[PDB]
Design an enzyme around this catalytic site. Sequence first.
Site, PDB file in Angstrom:
ATOM      1  N   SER A 114      21.818  38.096  12.561  1.00 17.28           N
ATOM      2  CA  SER A 114      23.146  38.648  12.616  1.00 17.28           C
ATOM      3  C   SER A 114      23.532  38.847  14.081  1.00 17.28           C
ATOM      4  O   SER A 114      22.776  39.423  14.849  1.00 17.28           O
ATOM      5  CB  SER A 114      23.194  39.955  11.839  1.00 17.28           C
ATOM      6  OG  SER A 114      24.353  40.691  12.209  1.00 17.28           O
ATOM      7  N   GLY A 115      24.692  38.339  14.470  1.00 13.67           N
ATOM      8  CA  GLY A 115      25.150  38.464  15.841  1.00 13.67           C
ATOM      9  C   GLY A 115      24.804  37.285  16.727  1.00 13.67           C
ATOM     10  O   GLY A 115      25.176  37.254  17.905  1.00 13.67           O
ATOM     11  N   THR A 140      28.862  32.189  12.857  1.00 13.89           N
ATOM     12  CA  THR A 140      30.246  32.097  12.444  1.00 13.89           C
ATOM     13  C   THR A 140      31.129  31.460  13.529  1.00 13.89           C
ATOM     14  O   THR A 140      31.959  30.609  13.208  1.00 13.89           O
ATOM     15  CB  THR A 140      30.766  33.435  11.945  1.00 13.89           C
ATOM     16  OG1 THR A 140      30.145  33.723  10.689  1.00 13.89           O
ATOM     17  CG2 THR A 140      32.269  33.387  11.735  1.00 13.89           C
ATOM     18  N   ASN A 171      26.546  43.468  14.632  1.00 15.00           N
ATOM     19  CA  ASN A 171      27.678  42.582  14.874  1.00 15.00           C
ATOM     20  C   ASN A 171      28.995  43.241  14.436  1.00 15.00           C
ATOM     21  O   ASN A 171      29.111  43.728  13.310  1.00 15.00           O
ATOM     22  CB  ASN A 171      27.439  41.248  14.151  1.00 15.00           C
ATOM     23  CG  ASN A 171      28.568  40.235  14.354  1.00 15.00           C
ATOM     24  OD1 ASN A 171      29.488  40.451  15.139  1.00 15.00           O
ATOM     25  ND2 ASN A 171      28.490  39.114  13.633  1.00 15.00           N
ATOM     26  N   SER A 188      30.334  41.046  11.488  1.00 15.63           N
ATOM     27  CA  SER A 188      29.253  40.500  10.674  1.00 15.63           C
ATOM     28  C   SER A 188      29.735  39.938   9.333  1.00 15.63           C
ATOM     29  O   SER A 188      30.437  40.620   8.567  1.00 15.63           O
ATOM     30  CB  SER A 188      28.168  41.548  10.435  1.00 15.63           C
ATOM     31  OG  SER A 188      27.041  40.964   9.795  1.00 15.63           O
ATOM     32  N   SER A 189      29.357  38.687   9.067  1.00 15.59           N
ATOM     33  CA  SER A 189      29.576  38.074   7.764  1.00 15.59           C
ATOM     34  C   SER A 189      28.689  38.779   6.739  1.00 15.59           C
ATOM     35  O   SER A 189      27.471  38.740   6.843  1.00 15.59           O
ATOM     36  CB  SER A 189      29.249  36.580   7.827  1.00 15.59           C
ATOM     37  OG  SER A 189      30.173  35.877   8.660  1.00 15.59           O
ATOM     38  N   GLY A 233      19.857  33.969   8.668  1.00 17.07           N
ATOM     39  CA  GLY A 233      18.435  33.675   8.685  1.00 17.07           C
ATOM     40  C   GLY A 233      17.512  34.856   8.403  1.00 17.07           C
ATOM     41  O   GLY A 233      17.932  35.959   8.002  1.00 17.07           O
ATOM     42  N   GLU A 270      15.301  37.874   9.579  1.00 23.14           N
ATOM     43  CA  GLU A 270      15.222  38.806  10.714  1.00 23.14           C
ATOM     44  C   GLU A 270      14.552  40.141  10.359  1.00 23.14           C
ATOM     45  O   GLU A 270      14.348  40.462   9.185  1.00 23.14           O
ATOM     46  CB  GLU A 270      16.595  39.034  11.356  1.00 23.14           C
ATOM     47  CG  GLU A 270      17.469  40.018  10.619  1.00 23.14           C
ATOM     48  CD  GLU A 270      18.815  40.202  11.279  1.00 23.14           C
ATOM     49  OE1 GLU A 270      19.776  39.569  10.810  1.00 23.14           O
ATOM     50  OE2 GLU A 270      18.912  40.985  12.256  1.00 23.14           O
TER      51      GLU A 270
HETATM   52  N1  ADP Z   1      30.059  30.648  21.768  1.00 20.08           N
HETATM   53  C1  ADP Z   1      30.582  31.884  21.890  1.00 20.08           C
HETATM   54  N2  ADP Z   1      31.492  32.146  22.836  1.00 20.08           N
HETATM   55  C2  ADP Z   1      32.021  33.371  22.970  1.00 20.08           C
HETATM   56  N3  ADP Z   1      31.707  34.412  22.184  1.00 20.08           N
HETATM   57  C3  ADP Z   1      30.799  34.285  21.201  1.00 20.08           C
HETATM   58  C4  ADP Z   1      30.172  32.978  20.992  1.00 20.08           C
HETATM   59  N4  ADP Z   1      29.312  33.120  19.966  1.00 20.08           N
HETATM   60  C5  ADP Z   1      29.376  34.407  19.550  1.00 20.08           C
HETATM   61  N5  ADP Z   1      30.264  35.101  20.291  1.00 20.08           N
HETATM   62  C6  ADP Z   1      30.546  36.540  20.120  1.00 20.08           C
HETATM   63  O1  ADP Z   1      29.470  37.059  19.342  1.00 20.08           O
HETATM   64  C7  ADP Z   1      29.974  37.727  18.180  1.00 20.08           C
HETATM   65  C8  ADP Z   1      29.097  37.508  16.967  1.00 20.08           C
HETATM   66  O2  ADP Z   1      29.070  36.120  16.672  1.00 20.08           O
HETATM   67  P1  ADP Z   1      29.011  35.650  15.134  1.00 20.08           P
HETATM   68  O3  ADP Z   1      29.391  34.180  15.140  1.00 20.08           O
HETATM   69  O4  ADP Z   1      29.727  36.667  14.289  1.00 20.08           O
HETATM   70  O5  ADP Z   1      27.467  35.823  14.714  1.00 20.08           O
HETATM   71  P2  ADP Z   1      26.870  35.622  13.202  1.00 20.08           P
HETATM   72  O6  ADP Z   1      27.894  34.875  12.355  1.00 20.08           O
HETATM   73  O7  ADP Z   1      25.666  34.792  13.612  1.00 20.08           O
HETATM   74  O8  ADP Z   1      26.521  37.011  12.670  1.00 20.08           O
HETATM   75  C9  ADP Z   1      31.360  37.165  17.956  1.00 20.08           C
HETATM   76  O9  ADP Z   1      32.167  38.201  17.422  1.00 20.08           O
HETATM   77  C10 ADP Z   1      31.808  36.836  19.352  1.00 20.08           C
HETATM   78  O10 ADP Z   1      32.231  38.076  19.904  1.00 20.08           O
HETATM   79  F1  BEF Z   2      25.348  36.955  10.650  1.00 20.08           F
HETATM   80 BE1  BEF Z   2      26.423  37.583  11.188  1.00 20.08          BE
HETATM   81  F2  BEF Z   2      26.236  38.919  11.114  1.00 20.08           F
HETATM   82  F3  BEF Z   2      27.549  37.257  10.503  1.00 20.08           F
HETATM   83 MG    MG Z   3      28.776  35.439  10.477  1.00 17.90          MG
END
Ligand code: ADP
Ligand code: BEF
Ligand code: MG
Lengths: 744, 148
Positions: free
Chosen positions: A150-151, A155, A197, A200-201, A403, A405
């Site tokens: 997460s984070g 996404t 996050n 967070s999704s 994934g 964690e």
């Molecule tokens: N390539 C990137 N460029 C700029 N900011 C990013 C990038 N990837 C992630 N972030 C920042 O990180 C935060 C979390 O990313 P996210 O895609 O929500 O993670 P996940 O879906 O893996 O939980 C986003 O809200 C954004 O603020």
């Molecule tokens: F996985 Be992230 F929190 F969406």
């Molecule tokens: Mg996500």
Amino acid sequence: GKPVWAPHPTDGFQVGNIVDIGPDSLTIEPLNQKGKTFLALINQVFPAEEDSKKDVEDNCSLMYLNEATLLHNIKVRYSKDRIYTYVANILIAVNPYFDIPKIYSSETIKSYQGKSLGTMPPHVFAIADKAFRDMKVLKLSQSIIVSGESGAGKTENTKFVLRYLTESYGTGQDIYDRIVEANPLLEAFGNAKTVRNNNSSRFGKFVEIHFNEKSSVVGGFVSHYLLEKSRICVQGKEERNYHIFYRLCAGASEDIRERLHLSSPDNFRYLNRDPLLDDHGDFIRMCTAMKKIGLDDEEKLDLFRVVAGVLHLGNIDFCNLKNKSTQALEYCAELLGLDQDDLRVSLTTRVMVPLKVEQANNARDALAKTVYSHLFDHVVNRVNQCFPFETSSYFIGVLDIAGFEYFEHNSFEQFCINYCNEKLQQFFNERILKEEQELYQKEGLGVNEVHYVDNQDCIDLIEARLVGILDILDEENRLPQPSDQHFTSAVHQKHKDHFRLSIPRKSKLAIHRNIRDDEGFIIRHFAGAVCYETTQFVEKNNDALHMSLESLICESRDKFIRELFESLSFISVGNKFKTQLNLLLDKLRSTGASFIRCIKPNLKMTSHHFEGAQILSQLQCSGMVSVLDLMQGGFPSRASFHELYNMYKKYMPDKLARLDPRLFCKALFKALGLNEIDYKFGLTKVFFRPGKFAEFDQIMKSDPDHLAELVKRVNHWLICSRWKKVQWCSLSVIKLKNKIKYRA
Amino acid sequence: ADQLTEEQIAEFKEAFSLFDKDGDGTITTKELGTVMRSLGQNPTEAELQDMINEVDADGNGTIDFPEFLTMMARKMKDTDSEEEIREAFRVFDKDGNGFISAAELRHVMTNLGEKLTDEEVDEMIREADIDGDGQVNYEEFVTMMTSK
Ligand SMILES: Nc1ncnc2c1ncn2[C@@H]1O[C@H](COP(=O)(O)OP(=O)(O)O)[C@@H](O)[C@H]1O
Ligand code: BEF
Ligand SMILES: [Mg+2]
Ligand SMILES: [Ca+2]
Ligand SMILES: [Ca+2]
Ligand SMILES: [Ca+2]
Ligand SMILES: [Ca+2]
């Protein structure tokens, strides 16, 4: 001797010198601190790049590809704001936590169109482009699997893929826009601020872009998995509920927030337990997306009502309702089109009879979750109605799911997510193995004895019919008196001897040994042991709303509220997911697949803060070290003739430095007498066995005079090659012009 | 191809890198024409398109070495093989006098993007120059072409 990488508790690895060899372990002296020493297992100490300042776009270009040289390579890249790196075909992406200039611009997107991996710097765009080209050329659907904790940026990298495709291959096609404008809508109902996050999704997703026989987009499809139910009613100290709640409370028109009896989020229990979060603006952005995919003002209202409905339902307090609540219940029964009496009746009384404070609470929340969850089902399905299709030839599918964690306390939700990642990991192992085999066959490299060992036994433990954990769990929900403890014993008794199962009290960690045998189990997941506290497993495995409450809502005044529910009261959460997960693998297994590993660099959402140990753990957990081991079995070092030529022309006679890269390298092999065992002159690259690249590098760096000497001894042969190259090229042009004739 | 010997295929593989300057193992029509023009030819894009469509099994518009090998293939009367070598030589011997001179080799090399000095061109001539007259004749050109 030469500096090496050895373990370091916070950096993952550190530079040090081997001062002493033991049978089991090596004595290391950390670089800086003469006199200091520590021990490392022999297999935990790794050779380093000579040049600690260089960085490469593909980790296969390293002289020594191992977890330590990999960690250090992405570390240098990340410090220079290069967050993308390859391991052969795999894309590693490290979250930068700030907006890097130029990298995602429309112009930069153009520069990636049509280009093969390697001809541009590593990038999510290159992976997107490759999925589209493999689709169009191979006539085979394609999947891009984006994983990480997460984070980590799954996404975001998923949006970049959809953006790239839309701008590259969907210019005149609005279907692409409706697909891009979908995620803003989903995120409203499915994302939420957590301590890991801010966005967070709270659900897994598969996004399919569907195509006809001419690589034209004909529709789209979205699968969603494992919505986080518990977050609908209660959330942790520093977290929130789903965005939509706060967005509608801070963006509703004066009129609407009056028709829906809405106040600030502080006025609701479901929101009670926001500087960087633009709820207001995000509300606006959401409504834009709704018009953009075709939601009428009426639907927008229907969704909002239910969201609001659920909010008031959470204010009803308990016995029977206090007076603070009789205004809540009134609002609630009006927004959900219910009879205020039956509702209060239904929240306070059960059929099997009166209800305590606790039982009335569970029933209120249970109904809340069910309503919200169906709402979310309706939303995702609504999105799929913005681009339906009765037929298609190919799809490109992007998987965005959490994934493996680490959690302090692993409950059922982690059990489902870890189950999922066992099957994805298997898929990933299978796929990397196939690519490597394919490469070795195309280039004549032979065989690789190294094989990932299967985790099917772990999957079977969880999912096998009758004896798998999920079925054992379902039996429990069906028993007269279901108990978490009886469930847990069933699992232990049934799998006492299972390789993958253990009793908590066998752990090395005291906090786990504290758990009674019938209160948890340890599963040896791909990434490592996970200790599950099974308390609540039985309740959490149940998605079914009690008959009384469900009837109340099914027969409701409002048509939209009734349509949410067009579907012993037990629906198995585990087994429902199993089925979804199995459908998803069916699809992935019919595709060519690419992999994007997202890495979260630290736990503070800051930029330029590389936590080596945290990152090393993600590389390990996500199977990457598994890949490095496979590669060590064959030719883990791979360099194009071009790359070699730029690296070494400076050490060679000017006469040689004048050749093209291919002929340059060809001359080096001949002059050096390179053994065909260790070195492979491929179609377009030189392939080296472990250590052999570093060895070739020493040869190039040895006595320049002797090198010139070796080259000279091969002079006649070199001149002849040069003659033949141009001579046969000439015959070529001629055979080609004769073919142009032959065809007329 | 299956009408070509191991040796023959090896030589064309090398010749191919001349079209495939970027060294990714695939060429387009763009690279086909550029090289052909450099050696005194001039196919129309339509002609290339037509020729490349025979072997371009996918639609990508790019081909690779074995597709190239088959794209050069055709039915040949005995006379055609020697007629072709005889004609490749005349790509080098630009003035038809029967001898490739250093200035002439130099012309072909630089035309093909080969980088070498004047001294090195003389060297190339010298090594092919079996009879020692300081230029390269047909027999000497053929000998060099077909030698490991
Ligand atoms: N390539 C990137 N460029 C700029 N900011 C990013 C990038 N990837 C992630 N972030 C920042 O990180 C935060 C979390 O990313 P996210 O895609 O929500 O993670 P996940 O879906 O893996 O939980 C986003 O809200 C954004 O603020
Ligand atoms: F996985 Be992230 F929190 F969406
Ligand atoms: Mg996500
Ligand atoms: Ca090329
Ligand atoms: Ca082709
Ligand atoms: Ca002449
Ligand atoms: Ca002569």
